Amino acid sequence: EGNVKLCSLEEAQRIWKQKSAEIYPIMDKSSRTRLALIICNEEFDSIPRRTGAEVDITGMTMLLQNLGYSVDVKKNLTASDMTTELEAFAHRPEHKTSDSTFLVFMSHGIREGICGKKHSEQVPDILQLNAIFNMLNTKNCPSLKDKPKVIIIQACRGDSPGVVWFKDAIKKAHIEKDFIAFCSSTPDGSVFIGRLIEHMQEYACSCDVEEIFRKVRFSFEQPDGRAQMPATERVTLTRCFYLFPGH
Secondary structure, eight states: OOOOOOHHHHHHHHHHTTTOOOOOOOTTTTTOOOEEEEEOOOSSSOOOOOHHHHHHHHHHHHHHHHHHOOOEESSSHHHHHHHHHHHHHHHHHGGOSOEEEEEEEEEEEETTTEEEETTSSSSSOOOOHHHHHHSTTTTTTGGGGOOOEEEEEEOOHHHHHHOOOOOOOOEEESOOOOOEEEEEEEOOOOHHHHHHHHHHHHHHHTOHHHHHHHHHHTTTOOSSOOOOEEEESSOOOSSSSOHHHHH
């Protein structure tokens, strides 16, 4: 399974000093109610089965639990069902007494969206990326205002970027803020999810999530399988999100 390295009292002190307190605050361990949602589509009407899905669900579930999240897992949804689930997730009371969330999507994709179980050329079944952000934004999810919302999107695409060959009384709040997305389109557990888990395990103690994502990219810098170069996207974090594993 691997092991999430903990942030020592010493490391935590270092982190708070160096970033001038521009860090997202964490709530008390014994009262906070952190939630995470995994939506995984493995079985589809018209597109290939994603056979490594159960290994990926297991790994992401155990990781997120080890980082302090209660994890819901939903499987084999249409875009409509994903929409319903995301709206419900946004309204969960636990977010009020949480400091953060993770949402993980694992499916096939197209350039502008995630495939639902019924997706076909002739009859689309697509969850737009915009919809995810809209449903979790400050209006629709006030409970996560000013709290980091980490969106992991594995949406496997036949046109994933590849390679080139060479020789040799009222107040205003921002509608959308405190998001970060990390996006993989590489098709065929899966290589991307495995590498992400390894890096979270090794570096959550010492690195903020943005830096962990960079390190994942660094680990993939030389292509060998189908090319992996997962992009960080749609970043409106204003502070560093350290997971402080063990706290």
